[PDB]
């Protein structure tokens, strides 16, 4: 059976795109987002001339910062920039292009070395970024050595060490699919074929009773991967229809606010995936997005949220009053204003990432986890999760 | 129609840095920007005309990782 997601309501799709639209005018390097560009080009929606300026800004920023900048882009982000080039039917080229390719190849080589011949060491970033890097190079018909592919193969193959999310497995599966379709790494062809099936099975076995694969925000990338190949013996069609039901409910309940998440979902709703960047169709008609004329406004209600940090001595626990509809980040700002609380964030393609709390920065294989009561990890970051009145938000330094 | 310390793409108003003016790359859609013109680690190999080291596995992989492309030269091999 095949993984098919029947077209959703055009109105519903349009309002998703309108969430992306304001970002088209935010061209500062801290806000530039190659995933947004890619998601839009693969969608049924377009931003017209704004897109061309956006790509131009991407090319200026990424090439000047990495070859010649305030907090220049990461290698993982460089990989997504490569996807953005494919989305405009370009191959990375010229002397500047060649150098960018080799920088991404160095990233993979360093992660391979960090992982080790034994496969105990972690990558310095994630296996998600490792897969993303292989995919990005493959989409531009750039080859990586079998030894590089081997680390991704071992990570998903039987008796592998560690546990990977649905997102990570899906990204790996996409990388494997590009290698297979391109007939790259022929000395790993059978293992690559087997790994794709392995990822299929693990993703299907991660489907919740609601219908999501892992969770609501893993479902988009999971669907992208599942759409790329048949799955004989399995009921892929049924699983994907159940996911659509789950996806539809989540959409109608306002689950998708984050621009990166929308950019990963929009291709699915247009029956496209990142694998369509092998043979891109850049001139396919797309509906022009117009700004949602919209009176947003304004709450009159005050809510109180308890903010707590038990990972530090002495511990922090305070009730914070904010306007209803405020984010966790607003709570953090208010806590800082009241005195006795500090924190730090850094920019990412998903928005502000919490890196430090009350002077304590997360170290290697550590992060500040966001939770609500009771002991329940948030599915959104500080700038997207909007706590309800009486909620308790915890920041917890954890190791993974 | 926009600042100094920087060259402009003539045929479509997009504006680009001067490090790209006459640099063999087609950065402008029209191509105007080109017209008025140490030890190596084990398992690595040195690029013939420079200081650079690359992994041995980048030899003959279809992409010039060396500035002089020496890693892709004797690559019609057996
Ligand atoms: C790896 C990973 C993943 N994560 Co995290 C998970 N699990 N994540 C990160 C890890 C980063 C560290 C590392 N060494 O890689 C990890 C485990 C620590 C992290 C943290 C969690 N993650 C979380 C979620 C919910 C997000 N994460 C994802 C991006 C989920 C991702 C899956 C996905 N579908 O995208 C994910 C698989 C891949 C991200 C990536 O590398 N993209 C490629 C990269 C090139 O882009 P980038 O923007 O430069 O990557 C940076 C950011 O993604 C930042 N970051 C990671 N997660 C988030 C989440 C938010 C909300 C923000 C603003 C930034 C981040 O870390 C990366 C830098 O290394 C997201 C889809 C995952 C999911 N399916 O649930 C989701 C995000 C959902 C959404 N509505 O936006 C947490 C909030 C969980 C929690 N309750 O604490 C938390 C972030 C808290 C904080 N301190 O701000
Ligand atoms: Ca969201
Ligand atoms: Ca520590
Ligand atoms: Ca040039
Ligand atoms: Ca080479």
Author numbering:
A (entry chain A): 1 to 68, 78 to 409
B (entry chain C): 53 to 89, 130 to 170
Please share excerpts from the published article on this structure.
Mammals depend on dietary uptake of Cobalamin (Cbl), which is a cofactor of at least two enzymes that are part of essential biochemical pathways. CD320 features an N-terminal, extracellular fragment comprising two LDLR type A (LDLR-A) domains separated by an epidermal growth factor (EGF) homology domain, the exact function of which has so far not been determined.
Various CD320 truncations were generated and tested and a final crystallization construct comprising residues 53–199 of the extracellular domain of CD320 and TC residues 1–409 was chosen for structure determination. The TC-CD320 co-crystal structure, phased by molecular replacement using Cbl-bound TC as a search model, was refined to 2.1 Å resolution and revealed a 1:1 complex of TC-CD320. Whereas clear electron density was observed for LDLR-A1 residues 53–89 and LDLR-A2 residues 129-171, no density was observed for the EGF-like domain (residues 90–128). In agreement with epitope mapping studies, both LDLR-A1 and LDLR-A2 of CD320 exclusively interact with the α domain of TC. The structure of CD320-bound TC is very similar to that of its free state20 (r.m.s.d of all Cα atoms of 0.43Å) with a few key differences. The interface of TC and CD320 consists of ∼900 Å2 buried surface area, with LDLR-A2 contributing 486 Å2 compared with 405 Å2 for LDLR-A1. The fold of the LDLR-A domains of CD320 is similar to that of related family members. Both LDLR-A domains contain central Ca2+ ions bound by four conserved acidic residues and two backbone carbonyls in an octahedral coordination. In LDLR-A1, the Ca2+-coordinating carboxylate groups of Asp75 and Asp79 form salt bridges with Lys105 of TC, forming an ‘acidic necklace' previously found to be a key feature of LDLR/ligand complexes. The equivalent acidic necklace in LDLR-A2 is formed by Lys114 of TC and the Ca2+ coordinating carboxylate groups of Asp153 and Asp157 of CD320. LDLR-A1 contacts TC helices α3 and α5, whereas LDLR-A2 interacts with TC helix α5 and the loop between helices α6 and α7.
